Amino acid sequence: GEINGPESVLVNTYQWIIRNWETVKIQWSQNPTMLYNKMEFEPFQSLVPKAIRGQYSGFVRTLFQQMRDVLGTFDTTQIIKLLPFAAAPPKQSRMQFSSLTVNVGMRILVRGNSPVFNYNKTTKRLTILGKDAGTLIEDPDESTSGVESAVLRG
């Protein structure tokens, strides 16, 4: 874990999700509301501007509900990315956010990578604010995790 201030809170939150993913995925499937309410996410929530925390949470919880209803747990990187923004008490709105800001305002883009959140499909590792957060499991049938074939030449 990192210790530098707000940046560390962000890095460590995603590290925690990755380290606990095999539990988190099951809670997200079976009892997501409970998952969203874990005190684990309180520090992250404090990085989200107070005036918009609730709106972001309404957006992400709704998106997750719609996601889960039609797709289930397919999208690991996206579930991990958005999960901490579900932590605040939700305030529902009709606003569709393309990005979500944290105070470190830096933007996490909803689709795809950003300076803040950068998943690489070749190494299968997540990078947050230029720091390693760990290895993601996109395919739950995979035995070997991490870097793809044909990366190291020899």
Numbering used by the authors: 537 to 640, 644 to 693
Question: What's the paper's own text on this?
Answer:
Here we extend the structure-based exploration of host determinant residues through the identification by random construct screening of a new PB2 domain (residues 538–693) that contains position 627 and is thus denoted the 627-domain. The 156 amino acid 627-domain is located between the cap-binding and NLS-domains and contains six of the seventeen host species determining sites described within the PB2 subunit: N567D/E, I588A/V, T613V/A, K627E, T661A, T674A/S where for each position the consensus human and then avian residues are given.
The N-terminal half (residues 538–623) comprises a 6 helical cluster with a hydrophobic core rich in aromatic residues. In the crystal, the C-terminal extension of the domain (residues 676–693) exhibits an extended conformation which is determined by the crystal packing. The domain fold is unlike any other known protein so the structure in itself does not shed light on the functional role of residue 627, although its exposed surface location suggests it might mediate an interaction with another viral or host protein. The high resolution crystal structure of this domain from a human influenza A strain and of the K627E variant, shows that it has a novel fold with Lys/Glu627 exposed to the solvent.
